Every structure is written in structure tokens, then in C-alpha cells.
Nucleic acid binder design. Sequence first.
RNA 1: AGAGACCGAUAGCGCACAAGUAGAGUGAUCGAAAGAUGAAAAGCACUUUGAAAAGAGGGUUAAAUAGCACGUGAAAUUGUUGAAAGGGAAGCGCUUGUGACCAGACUUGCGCCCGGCGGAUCAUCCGGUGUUCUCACCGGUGCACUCCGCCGGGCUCAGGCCA
RNA 2: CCGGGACCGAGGACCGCGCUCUGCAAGGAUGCUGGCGUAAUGGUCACCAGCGACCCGUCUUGAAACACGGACCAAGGAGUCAAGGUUUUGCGCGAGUGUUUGGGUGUAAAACCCGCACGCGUAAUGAAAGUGAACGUAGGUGAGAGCUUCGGCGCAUCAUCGA
RNA 3: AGACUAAUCGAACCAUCUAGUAGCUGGUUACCGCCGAAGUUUCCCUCAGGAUAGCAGUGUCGACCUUCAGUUUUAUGAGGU
RNA 4: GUCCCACCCAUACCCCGCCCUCAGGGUAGAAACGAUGCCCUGAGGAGUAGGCGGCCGUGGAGGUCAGUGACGAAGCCUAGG
Lengths: 52, 141, 148, 183, 124
Amino acid sequence: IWRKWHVKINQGQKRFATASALAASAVAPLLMARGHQVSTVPEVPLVVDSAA
Amino acid sequence: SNVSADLIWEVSRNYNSFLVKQRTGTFSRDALNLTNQHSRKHAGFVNDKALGIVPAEKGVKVIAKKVKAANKPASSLYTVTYKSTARKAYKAIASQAAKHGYRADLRQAAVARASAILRSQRPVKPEPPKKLRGAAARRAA
Amino acid sequence: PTRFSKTRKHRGHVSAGKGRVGKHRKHPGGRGMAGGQHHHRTNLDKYHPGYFGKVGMRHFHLLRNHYWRPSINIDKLWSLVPSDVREQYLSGQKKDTAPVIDLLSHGYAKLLGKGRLPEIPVVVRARYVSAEAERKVKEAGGVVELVA
Amino acid sequence: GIDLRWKHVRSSHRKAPKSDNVYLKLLVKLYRFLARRTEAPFNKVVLRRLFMSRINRPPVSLSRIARNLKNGNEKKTVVVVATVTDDNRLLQVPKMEVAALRFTAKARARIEAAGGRTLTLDQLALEKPTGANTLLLRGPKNAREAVKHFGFGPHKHKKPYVRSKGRKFERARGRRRSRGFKV
Amino acid sequence: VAAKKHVPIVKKRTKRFMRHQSDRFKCLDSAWRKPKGIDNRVRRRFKGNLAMPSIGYGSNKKTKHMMPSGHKAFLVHNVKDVELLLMHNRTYAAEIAHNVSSRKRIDIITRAKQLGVKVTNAKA
RNA sequence: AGAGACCGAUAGCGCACAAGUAGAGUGAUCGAAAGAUGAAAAGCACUUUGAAAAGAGGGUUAAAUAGCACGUGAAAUUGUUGAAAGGGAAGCGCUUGUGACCAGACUUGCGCCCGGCGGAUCAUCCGGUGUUCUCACCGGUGCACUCCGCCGGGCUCAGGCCA
RNA sequence: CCGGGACCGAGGACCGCGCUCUGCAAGGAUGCUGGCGUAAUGGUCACCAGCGACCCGUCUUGAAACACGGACCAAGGAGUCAAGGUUUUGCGCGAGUGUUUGGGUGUAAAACCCGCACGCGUAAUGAAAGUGAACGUAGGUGAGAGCUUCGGCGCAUCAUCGA
RNA sequence: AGACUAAUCGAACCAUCUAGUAGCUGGUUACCGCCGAAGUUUCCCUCAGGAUAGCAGUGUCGACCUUCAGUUUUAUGAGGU
RNA sequence: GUCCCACCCAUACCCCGCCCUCAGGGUAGAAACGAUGCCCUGAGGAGUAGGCGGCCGUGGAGGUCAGUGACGAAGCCUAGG
Ligand SMILES: [K+]
Ligand SMILES: [K+]
Ligand SMILES: [K+]
Ligand SMILES: [K+]
Ligand SMILES: [K+]
Ligand SMILES: [K+]
Ligand SMILES: [K+]
Ligand SMILES: [K+]
Ligand SMILES: [K+]
Ligand SMILES: [K+]
Ligand SMILES: [K+]
Ligand SMILES: [K+]
Ligand SMILES: [K+]
Ligand SMILES: [K+]
Ligand SMILES: [K+]
Ligand SMILES: [K+]
Ligand SMILES: [K+]
Ligand SMILES: [K+]
Ligand SMILES: [K+]
Ligand SMILES: [K+]
Ligand SMILES: [Mg+2]
Ligand SMILES: [Mg+2]
Ligand SMILES: [Mg+2]
Ligand SMILES: [Mg+2]
Ligand SMILES: [Mg+2]
Ligand SMILES: [Mg+2]
Ligand SMILES: [Mg+2]
Ligand SMILES: [Mg+2]
Ligand SMILES: [Mg+2]
Ligand SMILES: [Mg+2]
Ligand SMILES: [Mg+2]
Ligand SMILES: [Mg+2]
Ligand SMILES: [Mg+2]
Ligand SMILES: [Mg+2]
Ligand SMILES: [Mg+2]
Ligand SMILES: [Mg+2]
Ligand SMILES: [Mg+2]
Ligand SMILES: [Mg+2]
Ligand SMILES: [Mg+2]
Ligand SMILES: [Mg+2]
Ligand SMILES: [Mg+2]
Ligand SMILES: [Mg+2]
Ligand SMILES: [Mg+2]
Ligand SMILES: [Mg+2]
Ligand SMILES: [Mg+2]
Ligand SMILES: [Mg+2]
Ligand SMILES: [Mg+2]
Ligand SMILES: [Mg+2]
Ligand SMILES: [Mg+2]
Ligand SMILES: [Mg+2]
Ligand SMILES: [Mg+2]
Ligand SMILES: [Mg+2]
Ligand SMILES: [Mg+2]
Ligand SMILES: [Mg+2]
Ligand SMILES: [Mg+2]
Ligand SMILES: [Mg+2]
Ligand SMILES: [Mg+2]
Ligand SMILES: [Mg+2]
Ligand SMILES: [Mg+2]
């Protein structure tokens, strides 16, 4: 039971990777290459008014 | 900026959800891909200008992307249906590719794909019956 | 990961890369540092010269807090001033005041002197100071004083 | 038979980067094209240094740049295929323009505050596609803690692998003549 | 339809490289294994014994993977899979997976006839 | 009490079962093997041969190629039927022959001319809408030497195997 | 300078070197003709025939050995994990670097946030008391990629004399 | 008689320390591609074992450095078979 | 014993085809390319102990094929491809 189950990651490299993922979420060709169906969404990034 | 057609091909060159890989070749089930091959030249979803052809009820249906609406996918395609005559469809498709400098390298492929779709809408002729060579003596009894 | 290992590549080959004549037995040569003076002397003398013997005198119950005195050179004395104020002095806009630097509050005890000092007077407080370091501060127009 | 000493000899130098950075691949495509379609020896050197590993691309500081901006190099463009770091010892930064693989945050801020400008290696290819009026700089290769241990032996004055420093750690027999011999 | 023109196909060998001594012991399968014993007569290339595979038996790059008609096989599981061969009907042929039901098998064969695509396992 | 990038009946605790059981030893102590019919017993009524165990018919079931020696049912080893070889081992590599069995390929395709049949509306121009701003689509006009499809006849070209 | 035989036909618009120059044997085969369109060519298996062929694993200078293990089949069966070192590859930041001992918070063993100390590095040398890194544009000489106003400037690194 | 002490005696039987240690014998599980050895030097209660140098592979970097060589020629030394 | 013609066959030598390994070139005002691709040219291929590279299979985990299936999944047999 004393094998290594958890991994330590530098916090700077964590923050780099999450920012790189947010940028890729605003590229419509990448959304389709990950299997999403977005042929009828008006704009990307998609923003809705505070009606929720 | 940080994103272009060359960058997008770099992150999708090795795997994407359109890929179909096995022995004897690699294919792509992409809508904006003519010849359904995996390559930078034919990867329609990557490039800024691309062409795609699907069969219609009577003729063919052709889509192309508008470069000014790359971030508005609902209104980013220009769609035309050709259902009058074969030669008329060939001409309009060829002009749509190699007249204003919009992917003149896809001129030969676009015409040939429209030809294959219209060829498959004709009636299918019946096949001749199968003959026998070694089971013939077996069934002669 | 187990799939990146030469163990996987040895499957099917006798001896697992260890030899047919020598066989990877249990402990040929002893365990640990055995044989240092007898049959491992050739290793212990090429590397690690000075391994055997005694040198110096002993010190019972040594307390490391008695010997705490970190040092900083004059080369980096100006880096202890905040950056915005530092640029005003260097560009020559103060010309009427001098900075007073507390080495202990930054965690240093002795001031050594290695590099050069710009000709702007400064006041330094320290517990210890080198002979060269005091010469260069005074020549720039400053003064060092002792504080304990 | 053919009686040859060597056969199927492979090349000793890298032919591509070992990294998987997507933008470094775009940079390598650019300079592959330039090196083939230009006669400038400058372009071929930059291509090779983009293949190299981090211990073969040591950093370069602002002080080392200022040393080479003397004796008639005040208006050339400095090119460094490496990281450029800051130096606390240097109190006044001269004005210059530098093209580098990357800059640290303080190095970039001090260059621009003195009236200079920083470039990227792709901006450099657009402005100087032949490397005219440039100077190439490298950092110190051997200034690494591991190189001090290389080639240890008798009468070599290298650094030994020890776990601590003090009088009780490898200082008695073979290090002084009062205990046997010395080295 | 007929395949695109190609150079004639040569094989260089048709036998199968069976394992040494697998014709005498039933615990040894026939698949090839490389002998590694210190005395083995097959490893030392004695005259009159089994041969060992080498890269020198490889096939011409122009005719590799093509069946004697001239096509290359492609495995399909439904109707949309066979429509990927719309632009390749003189170079590829379709092969239906073993676990496809009899009703879906009828739909695939009908569609492939409209496209002019050859099917290898057709009769059923 | 809640869980898992754990094991899946020679694994996981010695134990998924009337397991610290049956059994061994004077004794301290040692210590196994063994899960699965079917949704439902609907677990085969009656007739006939046999001293009986059982067999042959006939029934139940989606299925008895599920009958309590019960899901699926591999190999070693054995019986019957069919094919073949054998003058002190057999097996194997290269290469012909004979006998048995068998996968492909081919069945036509494009084009030109002549005749018949049917349908439109081919080129041009006007209005509207898109778009890569010059290229298209829809509505109107067109209305027989234009355009499209089918059938019949003739001609050239290309097409399978061995020489 | 004339005869007679054998094996082979890679390549796929043009481009070149040439010649006996309406053209050609000059940077790689075309033209004409017959039979057959299926088990005829071809493939798999079994058997007879010619030539060839000692039982594998292992220790050993030397194994087919009168050297050891192996009657047969199925399932199991052997370089792993932790701490501490080291060289090399990839990545982040860079004179600094390291959130996760702990606190805040949560859709609750995840993910997200915080910063006082501390570790390694930024300075060595002596047994120790102790002392502690610029004469010079951070030196001179010989090589040295690259740049250059063509006079020169000279990275990394190597050899050498000094501070 | 080194005899007997439950088929066990030149020191009984049972559980645990215990997976006791072995420079010694046995075994060590798919394929293809490229390169390719040693039984020699010095030290060791060393002689069936190690460390150390050599022989081998892999990763590179400096210039693509007029750079080298199990060789011949010319001039010039040493040797006691 | 000596001399002279013709002839026989190695995985050696010469010419041709194909595989791989190594080396050297071409390819963007892109009618453009699994640029990790394609085109052109030359040489080489034995191997125990051992080193490195690339690939094939098995039990589980995240993502994706809007994958197959009682109109038959998995497993098993088969001198049929
Ligand atoms: K090894
Ligand atoms: K000290
Ligand atoms: K002494
Ligand atoms: K067998
Ligand atoms: K080989
Ligand atoms: K048990
Ligand atoms: K009892
Ligand atoms: K049923
Ligand atoms: K029944
Ligand atoms: K059953
Ligand atoms: K050739
Ligand atoms: K042995
Ligand atoms: K034996
Ligand atoms: K590392
Ligand atoms: K710190
Ligand atoms: K130079
Ligand atoms: K007893
Ligand atoms: K021994
Ligand atoms: K003599
Ligand atoms: K796996
Ligand atoms: Mg080996
Ligand atoms: Mg062994
Ligand atoms: Mg050893
Ligand atoms: Mg050879
Ligand atoms: Mg084969
Ligand atoms: Mg041998
Ligand atoms: Mg043997
Ligand atoms: Mg549990
Ligand atoms: Mg059992
Ligand atoms: Mg059990
Ligand atoms: Mg059972
Ligand atoms: Mg009955
Ligand atoms: Mg059933
Ligand atoms: Mg039974
Ligand atoms: Mg059963
Ligand atoms: Mg059997
Ligand atoms: Mg026989
Ligand atoms: Mg109209
Ligand atoms: Mg040819
Ligand atoms: Mg004929
Ligand atoms: Mg035959
Ligand atoms: Mg023989
Ligand atoms: Mg004998
Ligand atoms: Mg023995
Ligand atoms: Mg025996
Ligand atoms: Mg099992
Ligand atoms: Mg007794
Ligand atoms: Mg053990
Ligand atoms: Mg034991
Ligand atoms: Mg070799
Ligand atoms: Mg001794
Ligand atoms: Mg031995
Ligand atoms: Mg050099
Ligand atoms: Mg070189
Ligand atoms: Mg003598
Ligand atoms: Mg080899
Ligand atoms: Mg498991
Ligand atoms: Mg099935
Ligand atoms: Mg069988």
C-alpha cells in the first residue's frame, strides 16, 4: 500500500495548462474535432444574458 | 495572433474524431473533405477556404465557407443546389473553385466528386446468373 | 511504467541479458562497503581519496545557532533598495538625501566587498564588515556603523 | 567480400528537434525554407541550434551582452537562440535591440525601459532574411555544476561526490602527507 | 468495376515458415518462433533444414496489400462506412464484418451496387 | 457504516457450499476437495420387450444438440464409418507428376452516326435573392435545325487466359 | 564485315546528348496473327519419384554422444516495489525556485485559493581562533564560427603567461 | 553395543524466529532491423570469486578544421641474434 | 614421372529485377502537402555473450466512433479462402 498513488505538479504549470485550454475552447474547428455538434449555435464564445 | 490554419493542423495531425485508420489506408469522414483522405490539402475543417458536396434528392448540393464568419457557425456556410443538367452543374462548380482564386487546387477533385454522385442516381442494371464448375456435376444428379 | 522497460524486451531470450558464463548470483563481493581495504581498494583509492583516518579535534555538544552570520557583497548592496526609489537615485534626481540600509532586517550579518560601488553616499548598519568593504563605502562618500 | 573497416555508419548530429512544441515546429519549417533558398551562412547556423537540447543552449545575461556591444558594435542586432536573463550587478542598461528565443519578465522590462526593443525569431526573419548587421552570441557551456565532477582521478583537481562538507568527510589518507601520502 | 492498371504481382514465396519440431510435439503450435539454442541446426543454417524469415522476402511497394483482382480490402460495419469508398472504387473493395446481422447485410450490398463498389463476402 | 483504475472458483482469506468441517496423530498439533438444469418442474402420463437395471415407442419444452452422471463442452486418450501408404523406425527441405477439392477474372464500357418514342424548355433577355463583386440560384419569356431520357440499327476504340 | 542460339523489357506526356537529318536502332518493347473463355492457366491437400536432412534445452576449448533433464495434455509459473544517489531526454520559472506540515473553500478523499517559517542555490578557505575575491574598457599572446563601413570586431572552446 | 528413549538417536518429536545465508547446481515466456566482444594488465587469506585498465554499444557536440595513415621513398641514429 | 588440348560445378566474380539500411540532392509571391509526404542518385547486407530502434498481442482506465448485437454478442470445431 506504500506505492505512489498521487503526483505533485508545479502550480505554475497547472495554471499554464488551464489557460491554454480556455483559449482552445474559442476555436470552432477544434470543437468539431472533439465530437461536439455545433452547427446551429450563433456565435463562439456563446454568451447568454443573465436570464438564468 | 496565436491561432491559424497551420497551428490547427499541428494539433490535429495525429488524432481527431473524424479519423478512420486501419491497415491499407487512412480515411476521414469529414463533411468538407473531398476524396475522404487524411491530408493537409483535403482537411476541410482546418483550412480557411474549403468545399463540400453531398447528394440531394435530384442533383447535388454544394457548400463553401465564408471567411468573414469563421466564428459564427450558424451562418458560416454558403449553400447551392444544382438539379438541372449534368454539364451545367460541372461548369458552375468549376467556376466556383478556379475563377476568383478560391482553392483552385480543388478544381479537379470537386468536379469528379459531383460526377460520381450523379452516376450513382441512375437505375441499376440486373446481374447475370452465376455459373457452376465443380458443383455442376453435384447438381446434375 | 512497466511497458517502457528492457524487461519486456528480454522475454524469449535466455539469461535475461545477464550472461551465460557469469550468472547473476546473489552477492559476489560482499554486501555494502565490504572489502574497502582488501579487494575494493582499487576503487576506493581512485575515487574518494582521504576516506580512512582521523583529522582535527572534536567539539562536544555543538550549537549551530552560535555560528550564524550570513554575508552579502557590495556588488548587490543597491538591490536591497526598492526598485522605484532605486532608479531615482541612479538617474541623479535626489541629490539631497541619502539611503540608510539595515542589513539585519534583510537577514544578513556581515558586509563583504567584491565589486564596485557607484559614487552616491549611503549609510550602512552591520554587525561585521570587511576591510576592503569599508574602504569602498567611505570612498564613495558613505559610512558604515556597528549595531550588534 | 569487400574488405571494409566501416559499414552503415550513421550521422553524429541531430536532424530534427526532440521537442513536441507545436510553435517550435512552425519555426523549424520557416528556417528550413530559408536555409535552402538563400546563400547566407547565417541561416544555416540558426537552423542547427533550434534542434539542440537545453544543456546545449545555456542562458545569456544582460551583462554578457553589454560586453560585446563595445568597439564598434553599438548598432548591430543581437541574436541569441536561448533564454535571456537579467543581471542585478549591472546598474545602467545601454539601449539595444535583441532577438531571442525567450526573455524573462525582468529582462524584457529593463530593455524597453532604456529605449530598446525585443524581437522574436520570426520577426527577425521578416526584417533581416539574410542576417545582415547581426552578431551571434552563445552562453557559457561548461558553467554547469555537473561538469566539475567529470574526469575525477589522481592529480586532476576535480570535485568529488560526497554527502557533506567538513573535517570528517574524505580529508585524511591520500589527501595529506601526515596520513600516508597525498593523492 | 475493374481495377486501375498496375504492374504484375509477384509473391517470391507461398509457404508459411513453420516452427522447428512442431510436427513432432502437440504442445508446440505452428506459429514461427526464432530458435535460440547454442547448438540448434536451424539457427546455424545447415544445409537441408527449414529456412528463417528475412527482410529480403518483402513485396514490391507498388503491389503490396492488394488482392489478385487489384483492390485493397476495407472493413465496413454499416451503410455509412461503405459510402467512404465513393471516390475509390477502382482501388478499394468492401468486406463486411463477421458480426453484422442478415438484414443490415442486405442494406449494405444494395448501396454498394449503386456506387459500383466490389464486395468480397457477398453471397449469403 | 460507506467505498475502490483490487480478485473472478488451481484466483481472492485455509473456508463463496452442514469449514477450522470430514480425515490423520498417544499428544502438542496438522488440515482438504467441493459454485451454474429451465422463465416456470411443466422432473416424462400411457403401450410394449425384459427376472431386474433398463431399452423401443409416445409425451413436456423456444430448446432434451438442457433429463437431475444436468449452461457452454477444448486437448491428451478411445470406437465406428470413409480415403490412403507400408522388403530391419518415422517424421522434414527443394522440385515435377497423379488424384481429390477450390478462390479469382470474364459476362461489357465510353464515343460517333441513322430512325422511332416521350418529356421538357436549350440559348437570350426582365424581376428578386445570395455570394468568392463576378459568379450563381429562383420566378417570367422561350415553344421545335434547341435541351434531356429510353428503345432499334450501323461504325471506331478499349477490354480476360495461354501461345 | 557477315551468320546461329539463350535469358531479360525496369520506366510512363514533352524537355537531353546526338546522327546516315521529309526522318532514325539517339535519356529502358512495340507491331501482326491463331486457339480458348473455363477448372484450360492458377492455388490447397494426400501419395509415389530424384537429390538433401543425426534430439532438443544446458554447462563446455570441444555434444548426435556410452554427459545430465525430458512418457503425454490442459491451466498456473520467475528482474518487482520503496527510500537515497547519479548521467542523459522533455517541460515551467529563472538570481531565484518549491501551494498541498498547516489554513480557506467545495457540486466533498477531486478541483480551486493563501503565506509565516524552512530546504537547496547565490562565497571560499583553515584542525581551529579567524580572515574573506577588479592595476587594466574584467588583462596579454596563438587559433576560432559568424558579422563587417573590407580597415577590422571576434561567441563557445582549447593551449599559454599574469592579476 | 554410542545401545535404547513410540518403524525416528554420535543428541527425540511439535510450532515459531524463517521467504535463515550460499563466491555453488538448475531454470528464466512474441517478431523483425542495425552494430558487435573477451579469456589479457595491476591489487586482494586472491587461485570455481571481485575491483581496476583494455576490447563494445548508445547519446551528442566542434568545425564540415589541409586532416590524418598497422604503407613505400630519401637523409640520418641505436642493437650483439 | 613429365608435357598438352577440351570439358564439369560454389552462397565467390560480371549484367538485370525486387526488399531493407546508410549517405547526398529537389519541392511556396503555394494550381497546396498523412512536409512525419512525394520525386532523383550512389553504396552496402555473416554472427554467440551483449547494446539500441521499430512493431504485434493480453487484463483494466479517460475520450471518441451519435460503432456491432436475441432477425443471434462472446467462446469452441473446420487437409474452405
Ligand atoms: K545487461
Ligand atoms: K567558517
Ligand atoms: K600517526
Ligand atoms: K504441433
Ligand atoms: K539477420
Ligand atoms: K484452498
Ligand atoms: K484423531
Ligand atoms: K425465441
Ligand atoms: K423433443
Ligand atoms: K443447453
Ligand atoms: K531499376
Ligand atoms: K548443464
Ligand atoms: K539425456
Ligand atoms: K532531469
Ligand atoms: K528562500
Ligand atoms: K572568420
Ligand atoms: K511419535
Ligand atoms: K568459489
Ligand atoms: K655475441
Ligand atoms: K494495453
Ligand atoms: Mg542474443
Ligand atoms: Mg544458465
Ligand atoms: Mg559478473
Ligand atoms: Mg557481398
Ligand atoms: Mg505468405
Ligand atoms: Mg558452439
Ligand atoms: Mg546440443
Ligand atoms: Mg468493499
Ligand atoms: Mg474447481
Ligand atoms: Mg480457493
Ligand atoms: Mg458445471
Ligand atoms: Mg424414455
Ligand atoms: Mg440451444
Ligand atoms: Mg461426464
Ligand atoms: Mg453439458
Ligand atoms: Mg481427440
Ligand atoms: Mg509416409
Ligand atoms: Mg428559368
Ligand atoms: Mg514497362
Ligand atoms: Mg483470338
Ligand atoms: Mg491442376
Ligand atoms: Mg544424407
Ligand atoms: Mg561415446
Ligand atoms: Mg549435473
Ligand atoms: Mg529421465
Ligand atoms: Mg485461471
Ligand atoms: Mg526406535
Ligand atoms: Mg526467495
Ligand atoms: Mg530455506
Ligand atoms: Mg558486421
Ligand atoms: Mg590480506
Ligand atoms: Mg561451473
Ligand atoms: Mg574547429
Ligand atoms: Mg565533419
Ligand atoms: Mg644477449
Ligand atoms: Mg546482420
Ligand atoms: Mg489484473
Ligand atoms: Mg456467433
Ligand atoms: Mg484440426
